[PDB]
Chain length 179, copies 2
């Protein structure tokens, strides 16, 4: 029985910023709920490089979250859109804003595995005063009625140097207000 | 004859980061050319708040840039996609990575004005060691065979405080490598 296909997840700053920003922006218009999205990137050495992301319409019943939907058409359409403009990136997994694993995450991940068999879920912490921004997981089968569970994958916010200096330069740029 | 509809453009950090990141990422796979995209946001007080953006497929002939195309279907489709997930944002204009105005920018802007009559163009400086990240423009008519020209609009990287602390927190998070 083979080890994980992914042993580390590097989430690029833009992804974190995107996800946190999107989450806070929907929060201002009354978002009551976690955000779910797709992660795009590339794999090198059992290391997953998460370079991009996009939120997807997602609903889940707040009484029984076995009732949940993601439009895979939306995700495929968005991904196709992205492919037209972006440097080669692949669906490498998905994200949600957590804060923790939800019961239906295994099922969501099973839908995501349609697009990436070694789908990694990253919970992205969007709480301002939290953490360790990312927590990565890969679904793992536990044989007994065989069961699926998330196994933690080492994950970090990571950036190539030129990319971090771009972020550093970003922060030096900023003026307040705002609305 | 009335003054500009927009007198200041606040570009949010995520937009700059997105645009610079996208540009550098396509650069690594041999992008030879400026990136063009759409800006989304909202207007308050002749102040345009640019909160989001997306690149669009764009081609322009390098001999005669009167030959250029943007798929407005792509832009409408992407915008509709975004509307499904995002807090209310509108097409408020467009961007390109410059470094300077191109001859066909007035024409591009005319296409963008289909979506936003008071379209603002923002040239986003993606050069690492440059600047003043943004330069905003609004097309203005000069009556004589009446002519269109870009007028500079005050523009800044701007963030609400909570949003800047999120960026500050981003930079404190980052690890090197990278690839």
């Amino acid at each position: 029985m083979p080890e994980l296909a992914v042993q580390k997840v590097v989430v690029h700053p833009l992804v974190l910023l995107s996800v946190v920003d999107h989450f806070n922006r929907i929060g201002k218009v009354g978002n009551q709920k976690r955000v779910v999205g797709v992660l795009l990137g590339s794999w090198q050495k059992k290391v997953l490089d998460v370079s991009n992301s996009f939120a997807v319409p997602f609903d889940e019943d707040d009484k029984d979250d076995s009732v949940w939907f993601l439009d895979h058409d939306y995700l495929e359409n968005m991904y196709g859109m992205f492919k037209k403009v972006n440097a080669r990136e692949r669906i490498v997994g998905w994200y949600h804003t957590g804060p923790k694993l939800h019961k239906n995450d295994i099922a969501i991940n099973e839908l995501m595995k349609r697009y990436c068999p070694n789908s990694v879920l990253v919970i992205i912490d969007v709480k301002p005063k939290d953490g360790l921004p990312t927590e990565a997981y890969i679904s793992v089968e536990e044989v007994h009625p065989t069961s699926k569970t998330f196994e933690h994958v080492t994950s970090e916010i990571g950036a190539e140097e030129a990319e971090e200096v771009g972020v550093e330069h970003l922060l030096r740029d900023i003026k307040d207000t705002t609305v």
